[PDB]
A paper describes a structure:
Stimulated by the first neuraminidase (NA) crystal structures, the NAIs were designed to interact with the active site of all NA types. We identified a novel isoleucine to arginine change at position 223 (I223R) in the NA of a virus isolated from an immune suppressed child on prolonged oseltamivir and zanamivir therapy. In contrast to the frequently observed H275Y change, which causes selective resistance to oseltamivir, the I223R mutation conferred a resistance phenotype against both oseltamivir and zanamivir. Our results support this suggestion by indicating that a ligand-free form of the pandemic neuraminidase adopts an open conformation. Together with this structure we present the structures of the I223R mutant neuraminidase in complex with oseltamivir and zanamivir to investigate the resistance mechanism of the I223R mutant neuraminidase.
Crystals of wild type and mutant neuraminidases were grown in the absence or presence of the oseltamivir and zanamivir neuraminidase inhibitors. In the wild type N1 neuraminidase structure, a small pocket, the “223-pocket”, also adjacent to the active site, but distinct from the 150-cavity, contains two water molecules.
Author numbering:
A (entry chain D), B (entry chain A), C (entry chain C), D (entry chain B): 83 to 469
Amino acid sequence: VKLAGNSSLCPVSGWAIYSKDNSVRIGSKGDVFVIREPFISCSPLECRTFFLTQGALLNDKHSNGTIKDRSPYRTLMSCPIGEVPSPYNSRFESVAWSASACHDGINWLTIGISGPDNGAVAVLKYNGIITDTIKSWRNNILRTQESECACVNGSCFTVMTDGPSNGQASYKIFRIEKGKIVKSVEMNAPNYHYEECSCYPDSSEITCVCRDNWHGSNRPWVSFNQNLEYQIGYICSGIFGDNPRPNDKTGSCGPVSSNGANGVKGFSFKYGNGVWIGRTKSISSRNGFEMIWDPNGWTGTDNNFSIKQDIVGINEWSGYSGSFVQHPELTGLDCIRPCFWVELIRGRPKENTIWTSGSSISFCGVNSDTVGWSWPDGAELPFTIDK
Amino acid sequence: VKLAGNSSLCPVSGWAIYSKDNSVRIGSKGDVFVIREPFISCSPLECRTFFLTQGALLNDKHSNGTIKDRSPYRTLMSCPIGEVPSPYNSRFESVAWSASACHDGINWLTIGISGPDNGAVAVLKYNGIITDTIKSWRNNILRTQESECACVNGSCFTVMTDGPSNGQASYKIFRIEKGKIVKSVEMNAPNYHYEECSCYPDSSEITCVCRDNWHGSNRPWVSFNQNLEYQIGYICSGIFGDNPRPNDKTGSCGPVSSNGANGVKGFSFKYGNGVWIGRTKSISSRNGFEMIWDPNGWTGTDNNFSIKQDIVGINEWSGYSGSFVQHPELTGLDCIRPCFWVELIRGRPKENTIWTSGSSISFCGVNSDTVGWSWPDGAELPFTIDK
Amino acid sequence: VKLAGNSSLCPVSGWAIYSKDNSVRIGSKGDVFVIREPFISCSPLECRTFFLTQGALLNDKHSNGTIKDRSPYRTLMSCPIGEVPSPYNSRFESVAWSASACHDGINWLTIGISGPDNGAVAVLKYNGIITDTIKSWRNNILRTQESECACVNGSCFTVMTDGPSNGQASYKIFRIEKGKIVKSVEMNAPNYHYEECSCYPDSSEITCVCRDNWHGSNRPWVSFNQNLEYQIGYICSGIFGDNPRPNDKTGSCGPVSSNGANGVKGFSFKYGNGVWIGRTKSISSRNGFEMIWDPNGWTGTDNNFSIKQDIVGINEWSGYSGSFVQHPELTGLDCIRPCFWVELIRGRPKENTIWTSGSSISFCGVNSDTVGWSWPDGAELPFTIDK
Amino acid sequence: VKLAGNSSLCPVSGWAIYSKDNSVRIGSKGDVFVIREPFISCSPLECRTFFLTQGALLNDKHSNGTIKDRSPYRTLMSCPIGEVPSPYNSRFESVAWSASACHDGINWLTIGISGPDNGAVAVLKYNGIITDTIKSWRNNILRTQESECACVNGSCFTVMTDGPSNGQASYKIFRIEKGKIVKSVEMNAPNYHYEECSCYPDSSEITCVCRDNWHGSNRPWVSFNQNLEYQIGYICSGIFGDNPRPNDKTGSCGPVSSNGANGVKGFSFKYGNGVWIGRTKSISSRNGFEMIWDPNGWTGTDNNFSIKQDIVGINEWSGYSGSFVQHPELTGLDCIRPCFWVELIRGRPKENTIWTSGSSISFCGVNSDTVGWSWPDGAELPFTIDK
Ligand SMILES: *[C@@H]1O[C@H](CO)[C@@H](O[C@@H]2O[C@H](CO)[C@@H](O)[C@H](O)[C@H]2NC(C)=O)[C@H](O)[C@H]1NC(C)=O
Ligand SMILES: CCC(CC)O[C@@H]1C=C(C(=O)O)C[C@H](N)[C@H]1NC(C)=O
Ligand SMILES: CCC(CC)O[C@@H]1C=C(C(=O)O)C[C@H](N)[C@H]1NC(C)=O
Ligand SMILES: CCC(CC)O[C@@H]1C=C(C(=O)O)C[C@H](N)[C@H]1NC(C)=O
Ligand SMILES: CCC(CC)O[C@@H]1C=C(C(=O)O)C[C@H](N)[C@H]1NC(C)=O
Ligand SMILES: *[C@@H]1O[C@H](CO)[C@@H](O)[C@H](O)[C@H]1NC(C)=O
Ligand SMILES: *[C@@H]1O[C@H](CO)[C@@H](O)[C@H](O)[C@H]1NC(C)=O
Ligand SMILES: *[C@@H]1O[C@H](CO)[C@@H](O)[C@H](O)[C@H]1NC(C)=O
Ligand SMILES: *[C@@H]1O[C@H](CO)[C@@H](O)[C@H](O)[C@H]1NC(C)=O
Ligand SMILES: *[C@@H]1O[C@H](CO)[C@@H](O)[C@H](O)[C@H]1NC(C)=O
Ligand SMILES: *[C@@H]1O[C@H](CO)[C@@H](O)[C@H](O)[C@H]1NC(C)=O
Ligand SMILES: *[C@@H]1O[C@H](CO)[C@@H](O)[C@H](O)[C@H]1NC(C)=O
Ligand SMILES: *[C@@H]1O[C@H](CO)[C@@H](O)[C@H](O)[C@H]1NC(C)=O
Ligand SMILES: *[C@@H]1O[C@H](CO)[C@@H](O)[C@H](O)[C@H]1NC(C)=O
Ligand SMILES: *[C@@H]1O[C@H](CO)[C@@H](O)[C@H](O)[C@H]1NC(C)=O
Ligand SMILES: *[C@@H]1O[C@H](CO)[C@@H](O)[C@H](O)[C@H]1NC(C)=O
Ligand SMILES: [Ca+2]
Ligand SMILES: [Ca+2]
Ligand SMILES: [Ca+2]
Ligand SMILES: [Ca+2]
Ligand SMILES: [Ca+2]
Ligand SMILES: [Ca+2]
Ligand SMILES: [Ca+2]
Ligand SMILES: [Ca+2]
């Protein structure tokens, strides 16, 4: 049965550890893909980790040069949550160096972008069969979420970008039904920049929190209904969510320029005027992770907050993070439950290896007791192949 | 359908070998997790082996230092009984350095504790979805069975301990329904010590046989009904069950102080005034294993027994042991069948390696002919990684 | 339910990338079969890659000498599309050094040829059970498609060749029902040569495009109805499809003798007088791959064409290619969708290794936007075993 | 639904190759169990290979000394037919150094013998649950078929031996229902010797062809009905079936003394007065394999035969062989189809290695065209671990 997606997001006071794969530790000997850009998505029956492989295994010579983002060898694959991504346990999804995926309650939708930078093509699959494609409309790296799309009542929604990563680009919202693009809208967003959106359903509407790689240290957001009527803004909290970013201070409802260039994929959950912000602990590099509840941070610009929970230590590597939800159809609850994942990036450019790869952790929102700690990647670098 | 749990334990005259995984032997070459604290639990359709990984594989450098009990890398995972615990065949359950699991007849309950020693949190999952959490109440290594919880009529039961491992601690019993704690009781047990309980259902009541790490070389027990009304005692038999222990003498109905400090997880099955006792063969180390039937050993203090069956030879490594049961809903019998498993610990601290890991064997009680033998681990240490 | 096979081929404007397995890159470390002659075939539920193993893994000494085509160690196996062919994820099909397979909508049919060159036997299995055999009738390497057979209304069809690969041979067409040969016909085709046919259903009739290894650098074809009444010809286009071949010039409706000796397995899709041709980029070796639409190339001899889409760059290795289809029963479309795969051959005879193996890519035809690129094998040769 | 087992054995004129696993070649790199005593058995849905592992993988140090027959590390496991026996694709069955298994149409029965030579215990499991045990009655290596048991009308039948392998021993036939022994009879067979029976159903009765290890170079047989009323004899053919054996000459309907000591597990299929005999090609060692049709060989003593089909070349290693059948419930045929497997033994005692392991091939009987060839193991010895 189709996910209804019409209930509200469950309010939560804390985050309980849900999974840890130890991928890089295990890949030191085991046959584990070199990956990056992992994300989690759930069906009414199961949660899966999706990821972009480099078409190579850890500790093998073909992991050489895997700091490179886009190549014909990259593929979107998936495995059950918490298991290491191996050629022996992973399902093939598509050929992709940028991707998204989500389940509408009936079948998996996957979106995999491959091809040259000047003419990339997103291939849409529904239940593993090609159902549609869309080609680059600005000829400058067509790219998408690197996290799950959001589903409401049999329609799935995603955001794609085409154009400069360091200046004004073009941003489109899509509605997809059974793998067919049935509507798209280009956002009219002058002076905004959207990359790598983390999108979730909440009361039949979609909220996306994204990355301004151009000139924003706070995160831009876009919200829309099923007809793709939309609103845009930036998270106002002085608790800045991007990385890099400046010191916390008075915020802005527009892009905060200071340290605004570059960024990292991230997420936040809106609750009225309040916001749960996940972010790195460092203002300069992808180190640490923490969750912060700011009760008026969606719309208010002060840097006060009410709850902070430690997730990864400042002296440990982190990386991308993203939202995922668990629908009532899966959980039996009366609301849509918020969860998130964190990518723990190891290797280049911060460490002296020939490769770059990630492992992952994830957490789900609860209203019972939780504890801050650090659950880092834990691998000992360099590896044999690096010697 | 819910497991009734209302029939009695099958009377058994001996133990038939059920499984052996040869994990450490296989892990010399194959990709096998470093694990400890394995245990078995059954649904109405299958038996699974659960275990706490160290987030590392045997014969890899990340196995270095795995004598260490608690870290953020440890995860509870499971695989089909008798198969090696591998990243290619194991299902992820929970992030955990202490755990329990059982099946109510409908879905799996797992309990996984992680976090800092001074503020750990147990995460409960029902069918893999987080359903409850509970925080440490003594701030000193919140910890649980390391074997299966027990289920009666749709409720599951477990025991957790928090506080000193070398003096009076705090012991709680829980009733859990669909992964939610619906009642807990703190045991009023001054001068008793309970760790790592092996609990089983019998005529709608739960009996747990546990480990006194403080000052008892005989095993403490707690029995309770579905309302958590409980009774406590120590096994009276002069056939002492813990390790270390003194040589068999006249026993006691309270804790036997002689060699009472420290211990090993173990189990026993009560039959009226009699008891089936599983224990190491050595009185000083985790070597050997044997099953002993003492017809008056639950309540009586002499050291006379009438059946002894060899399981692991005295010159071979053993370790933890625990009960599991097979319910009528699985077996088609008219009673609950008692079974047990033994963990065979290899590596530190007794052997010259950088790592510690275990393999397992298991047996089921029958009333047909059986035989004693020795079914040891059989790996040849040290391994390549140790040289 | 049986595949009807009565609708027409979907007209297509381009080819969207569907799968890429990265087998050779991954097999540098992981346990991946040495294979050649892969192909894809679909059921109403799933698509699988079939392949002929060499009974050996990459980077192991038993890969030595695997340039050799026929041995008793070769087996037909299959795995899900896009996954690497590993002993841990592959289903065994048959013992075979030449093969075909297809699904009639109810069960898989496989055809596996093994035995001596002077008396080989094809073993037919339906749902994994042996249902028929046919022995060599010319005693000179009985051999078959190395791609999927074609099914219409509960009957499946294939072509086999027996006799010289450098001169006139004998060619038979078979109708197979539930794994039993129910009719066969020997083609009367003087001066034709048919090897390794790629056959697809289209409006209840079968069209095969094959390899002339004797004296044609264009491809021979045969089409037939369910009663095995047949027509024969060569693709007339001056855009020659075989490898090796001459530079494009005026074509022939018979075999083009210029550079006509030898060849490579290939395919083409007929649309009226037009043809989609897949071919290598190099005229002299198995390098590069491209798809070309020639609006009058089935029957016209000019070398003019409308569309070209790049698949593999001319400086990268390619190899065999073949057609596969996805029926309406799988896709929900009102027509039969054409797709194709390409084998990317690495090792001998072109590279300094002891072994020969391939990886694969595949594409499906669509009417939405697509893009040419190069999706090559990507392995770095030689491997450890070659030193 | 229960297998009826009431139709006759299909008459067959030749043997078509069914499977080949290449286990030893693949295990040179991949994670493949050291095994011996493989056998095949089918359910109404699938065919599986069963085997006795040595609790160790190929090319690892724990494969040392695996010439040894009985140890506590040996386990019965199974995998789909034609797949390599790996810890990643194998199902655990039982702890066993002698075994049998068969499917009654409803569930798998496995029988696994372990324990000391003077008191071994067979453990019976039905659907993986222990259902019965039987202990040694002569205290001298209780042992069984090492091939599939035979099922008729919901009852399964096997033969076990206890006592000397070089003189008169004790042989029992068992009827088993839902894993419970419901009847047994001790065979009154002075001067007969029965080891390692290959038994098959045929028209509601069971026929077993076994190994005389005491003083016969032809094979003993026993036939019985569902009530365990039985008859005994030896295959009369002068085409001697055992290994070692003398050169063919006039046979005996009793044990042929010449070269009678020792032997190898094998099989034969009775058709009236005639017999299909599978045997090694060498009269002195386990080399080569061939199928021979002797139209009066069940009952007549001449060495005349009418068909011979080569299976393994005389210069190649062979080993155990055994029957298995495919019932009408699986095949859709109106008779019971005879098939057989051959174990190809590599390593000790004939080759310079520290280990012994086998691969397997299998064939099914057909009435269509077939061919002889050699399908040998193909591994290159010694392995890395041997050097
Ligand atoms: C296991 O861990 C120990 C550290 O706890 C490693 O020993 C160290 O090796 C480094 C060289 O990288 C030396 O500089 C240190 O002095 C060593 N420490 C100690 C306490 O000896 C050891 O190499 C590890 N073994 C592995 C990874 O195989
Ligand atoms: C091309 C712009 C884009 C978003 C800013 O770059 C991303 C930077 C990422 C990063 O900052 O780590 C890595 C991503 N793999 C990459 N995406 C693509 C499609 O290459
Ligand atoms: C902390 C007390 C506890 C019980 C005595 O210690 C156990 C001793 C065990 C042991 O005796 O081998 C190892 C266990 N993994 C450990 N449990 C935890 C949670 O670390
Ligand atoms: C025997 C003739 C045949 C077709 C021309 O050769 C093929 C050449 C092939 C090739 O050109 O690469 C390799 C094939 N495996 C081989 N087929 C067999 C059965 O050996
Ligand atoms: C103990 C007698 C028996 C049959 C003659 O020996 C067999 C000889 C076999 C052989 O000849 O290769 C190997 C078997 N694994 C062994 N069976 C057992 C249970 O050890
Ligand atoms: C959500 O949708 C379902 C299906 O229509 C409906 O029954 C339910 O009332 C809705 N819940 C809301 C609106 O919160
Ligand atoms: C990685 O690539 C660099 C540059 O091509 C090369 O010099 C180096 O040898 C490579 N390292 C490995 C381990 O392949
Ligand atoms: C959801 O979709 C269904 C089916 O298309 C449609 O009929 C209905 O209007 C929608 N329901 C809600 C709650 O919007
Ligand atoms: C156990 O409970 C079941 C379900 O109520 C019942 O059918 C059965 O008779 C009970 N057995 C007892 C009370 O011993
Ligand atoms: C078992 O559970 C059912 C449902 O809650 C209840 O009605 C019944 O009384 C229970 N039996 C007991 C408590 O023994
Ligand atoms: C294909 O066959 C089906 C089933 O007979 C039929 O319903 C359909 O009309 C056919 N399609 C054609 C002839 O195009
Ligand atoms: C491959 O085979 C050749 C010829 O027999 C042999 O000389 C060579 O050593 C082999 N190479 C390997 C790595 O086995
Ligand atoms: C398809 O097959 C069925 C069963 O033989 C037959 O009745 C029907 O006429 C066939 N349709 C055709 C030939 O298109
Ligand atoms: C075999 O037994 C079945 C009943 O179990 C009967 O219907 C059939 O006629 C018998 N004959 C065969 C198929 O051998
Ligand atoms: C196997 O054991 C033999 C005899 O003890 C010994 O000579 C040899 O070194 C061992 N080999 C390995 C690799 O364990
Ligand atoms: C199988 O056994 C019993 C009678 O002995 C009964 O279920 C059935 O009639 C039998 N079927 C036969 C004789 O094939
Ligand atoms: Ca930014
Ligand atoms: Ca605030
Ligand atoms: Ca103690
Ligand atoms: Ca006593
Ligand atoms: Ca040619
Ligand atoms: Ca043209
Ligand atoms: Ca003999
Ligand atoms: Ca004769």
